[PDB]
Design a protein around this nucleic acid. Structure first.
Ligand SMILES: [Mg+2]
Ligand SMILES: [Mg+2]
Ligand SMILES: [Mg+2]
Ligand SMILES: [Mg+2]
Ligand SMILES: [Mg+2]
Ligand SMILES: [Mg+2]
Ligand SMILES: [Mg+2]
Ligand SMILES: [Mg+2]
Ligand SMILES: [Mg+2]
Ligand SMILES: [Mg+2]
Ligand SMILES: [Mg+2]
Ligand SMILES: [Mg+2]
Ligand SMILES: [Mg+2]
Ligand SMILES: [Mg+2]
Ligand SMILES: [Mg+2]
Ligand SMILES: [Mg+2]
Ligand SMILES: [Mg+2]
Lengths: 97, 25, 63, 226, 127
RNA sequence: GGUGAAAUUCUUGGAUUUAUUGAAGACUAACUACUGCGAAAGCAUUUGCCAAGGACGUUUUCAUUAAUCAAGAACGAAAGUUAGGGGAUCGAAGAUGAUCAGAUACCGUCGUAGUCUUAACCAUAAACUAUGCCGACUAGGGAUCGGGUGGUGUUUUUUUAAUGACCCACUCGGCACCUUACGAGAAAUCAAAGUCUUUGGGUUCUGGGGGGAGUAUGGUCGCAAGGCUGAAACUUAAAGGAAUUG
RNA sequence: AAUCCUGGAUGGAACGACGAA
RNA sequence: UUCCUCGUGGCCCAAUGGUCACGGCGUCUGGCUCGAACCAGAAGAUUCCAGGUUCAAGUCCUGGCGGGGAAGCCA
């Protein structure tokens, strides 16, 4: 039977969405059935930033940031300890944590 | 078995029969 | 023949599949203000001391 | 990985940093700093003339390093070598471009992105592809959460922008354009022209690239380095 | 005061490249990888290997005359991962701790405007 | 290099890597969302031309011209076919390296056809909202796309105007959504799957236990691949749907 | 009275079972 | 019929004149687990038959046994 009304995705009025590729397994998944995350991170880490500031000329600088948008297929997202699995009542919860 | 492959088998056998009947016709 | 002494300041948790390893954040006695996260094989307390054969390495922290 | 190679040689020491020499890089006078850094070449033999091996070099360096100010911290500038006079090699402007960190920082969702690009030539018979970028903003008193445009606003904005750049380049030679770029007056003009159409935050221009240069004309170059 | 180079870390999975140049990039110094400082093919990627590579290029730059360095960290990019590998930040910390100075880190992973096609199929790299 | 790990493979003839350019062809990131248009299939760089279309507004016009529709006609993803072109990437086949008890499978490296285009065929799909179209009525709530109305509302212009962008109230139309069940339903669930034993608004199509079988035969279309149409013999007591606890 | 800050991953092999109830 | 070649553990196969002879599968035993697969391990040979050379023949030489291949043409 029907597990979901959205059926997996966000296709209401479209027909076709012109998919993308999972960055882990290269699987062609539609852009709406995918899972988009955004890994906004500092370039180095929390640890070595002190060493870098110590060894840096140009003080006060910025520590710029690396921004990469991630798409995963369902299978890879579930393997990688992401959207894992939920109860029938909490499946309807559509907001993040 | 999978209905897709069973279908593929019927299609192959149809092809077989079609030509072995063309042998006479 | 260089080695580095490091004082334990914080025990984080156990690690390794069989639990025979412990993550600890230490404080270098010499060249203080430096804190590094390391694995340990045996039992360990806070304020124990470690002899790092090499100081420029930290473990993948379990977070 | 070390002792893995089957064969190093199909058919079957001289360390070179004694064989090399250092040069220091001079930028034009449309920059509060000239001393960019240093480079390397081999010693000028008789069959090489290292000047020509070093002529067509390109070096990208930050505008904040050329001006001192960290306001122009993203804003990388590519400089092309064009002449050498005794170990103080001169450069000229080759093209600008932003940092990916700043660009992706601009690019946030639930706002509309606008882009323009024009292919204009200058007074000094250069040809440039100037890129412009802009982003919608969420006004004050605004309650809805995305601030998208109606896609004819976008075409009008792009028309305006392209006309502005074609106007402001024709008349600017190359250094005139560099000194128009650096203070970011163009962005102010775009905002003053588009405020009557749509808000438009983050109207930093974008990378600019040369396509084809005129003849060398060493005099115009040495006019810069005083 | 400071003589600047450019470090160009390319930190993929399966390997890590530290190799440093003048500001122009045409003239290069001290290209060393992780697989030159380890013998597995399995630890070519690892932070220890990258750290050793960075130590070597720091030594060579210092014995040339270079004192500071700009950084351009990179992944395989293109159609491939675009997330940097493990041994990039390690090499960075290493060449910082060795005695060099740093200026203007940047990430220069080559990104497409939806270029050609990823490999694996539409069903993916199965395993 | 690639991998879970390796190996095939490339490398002192300088591989990988760096910088500078050039060419080719494909693609159109991030913006890109419970957002838009389209009869559907489907459609995402810019600008220009060409013709079209929906909604909105209208104290304009005809005046029942309409709804659904065997026959019959147009478009119809991808794959595929013919002929030219182009042929960078990926890559049914195939070849190889491994894995394995075997592995002509998964993984890796190559790689033809195809992938793109033009002219012409095909006429299918989980072509799915698995929900026919037209129409009326029936509960609350907010958000949003497009148009429109009103407001001494906010901001920018030239303090000021008219604009434009926002705010509030309302409205027509659309993609949808949330909550409840008065109701319906076998239930899962449904503002339509309701107004159906208190059984009739209008119309088209399809189905009648499971297999055999979408098979055989005969027609028809097609270059073919195949499509549309489509049995019987024989066989069987259960197949199946939704939920329940293990 | 001094005082700038952070969160984060994968990782091989594992065939089969008379029906009756 | 002639010429050439072959014969080795239950099967396939290798051998420098120089150890009652190498390998793989099969078989037997034990272990993991009921069986496979896997891990450890064993045993099994008159090297087709009869003679000869040599200190010694699986091997080197003559004869037979059986298997295979090539040739058997001009008319
Ligand atoms: Mg579809
Ligand atoms: Mg090279
Ligand atoms: Mg785009
Ligand atoms: Mg839109
Ligand atoms: Mg059908
Ligand atoms: Mg259907
Ligand atoms: Mg209705
Ligand atoms: Mg409205
Ligand atoms: Mg509405
Ligand atoms: Mg709609
Ligand atoms: Mg019946
Ligand atoms: Mg029936
Ligand atoms: Mg019975
Ligand atoms: Mg069921
Ligand atoms: Mg069996
Ligand atoms: Mg069986
Ligand atoms: Mg046994």
């Amino acid at each position: 039977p029907k597990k979901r009304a959205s059926n997996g995705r966000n296709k209401k009025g479209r027909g076709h969405v012109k998919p993308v590729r999972c960055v882990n397994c290269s699987k062609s998944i539609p852009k709406d059935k995918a899972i988009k995350r955004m890994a906004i991170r500092n370039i180095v880490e929390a640890a070595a930033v002190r060493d870098l500031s110590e060894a840096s000329v140009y003080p006060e600088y910025a520590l710029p940031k690396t921004y990469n948008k991630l798409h995963y297929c369902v299978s890879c997202a579930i393997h990688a300890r992401i959207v894992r699995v939920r109860s029938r009542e909490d499946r309807k919860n559509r907001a993040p944590p | 078995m999978r209905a897709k492959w069973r279908k593929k088998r019927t299609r192959r056998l149809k092809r077989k029969r079609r030509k072995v009947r063309a042998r006479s016709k | 023949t260089p080695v580095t002494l490091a004082k334990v300041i914080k025990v984080l948790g156990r690690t390794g599949s069989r639990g025979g390893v412990t993550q600890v954040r230490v404080e270098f006695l010499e060249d203080t203000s430096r804190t590094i996260v390391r694995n340990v094989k045996g039992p360990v307390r806070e304020n124990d001391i470690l002899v790092l054969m090499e100081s420029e390495r930290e473990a993948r922290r379990l977070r | 990985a070390v002792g893995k190679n089957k064969r190093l040689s199909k058919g079957k020491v001289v360390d070179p940093f004694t064989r090399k020499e250092w040069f220091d890089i001079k930028a034009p006078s449309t920059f509060e700093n000239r001393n960019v850094g240093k480079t390397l070449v081999n010693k000028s033999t008789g069959l090489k003339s290292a000047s020509d091996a070093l002529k067509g070099r390109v070096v990208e360096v930050c505008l904040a390093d050329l001006q001192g100010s960290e306001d122009h911290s993203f804003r990388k500038i590519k400089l092309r070598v064009d002449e050498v006079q005794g170990k103080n090699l001169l450069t000229n402007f080759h093209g600008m471009d932003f940092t990916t960190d700043k660009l992706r920082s601009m690019v946030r969702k639930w706002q509309t992105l606008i882009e323009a690009n024009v292919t204009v030539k200058t007074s000094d018979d250069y040809v440039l592809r100037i890129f412009a970028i802009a982003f919608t903003r969420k006004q004050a008193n605004q309650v809805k959460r995305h601030s998208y445009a109606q896609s004819s606003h976008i075409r009008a904005i792009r028309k305006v922008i392209s006309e502005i750049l074609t106007k402001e380049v024709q008349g600017s030679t190359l250094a005139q354009l560099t000194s128009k770029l650096i203070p970011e007056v163009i962005n102010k003009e775009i905002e003053n022209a588009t405020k009557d159409i749509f808000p438009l935050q983050n109207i930093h221009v974008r990378k600019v690239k040369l396509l084809k240069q005129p003849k060398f004309d060493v005099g115009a170059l040495m006019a810069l380095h005083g | 005061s400071q003589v600047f180079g450019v470090a160009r870390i390319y930190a993929s999975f399966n390997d890590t490249f530290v190799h440093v140049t003048d500001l122009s990039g045409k003239e290069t110094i001290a290209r060393v990888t992780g697989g030159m400082k380890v013998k597995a093919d399995r630890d070519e990627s690892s932070p220890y290997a990258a750290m050793l590579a960075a130590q070597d290029v720091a030594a060579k730059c210092k014995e040339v005359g270079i004192t500071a360095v700009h950084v351009k960290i990179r992944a395989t990019g293109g159609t491939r991962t675009k997330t940097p590998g493990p041994g990039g930040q390690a090499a960075l910390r290493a060449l910082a701790r060795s005695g060099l100075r740093i200026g203007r880190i940047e990430d220069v992973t080559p990104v497409p405007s939806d270029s050609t096609r990823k490999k694996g199929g539409r069903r993916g790299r199965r395993l």
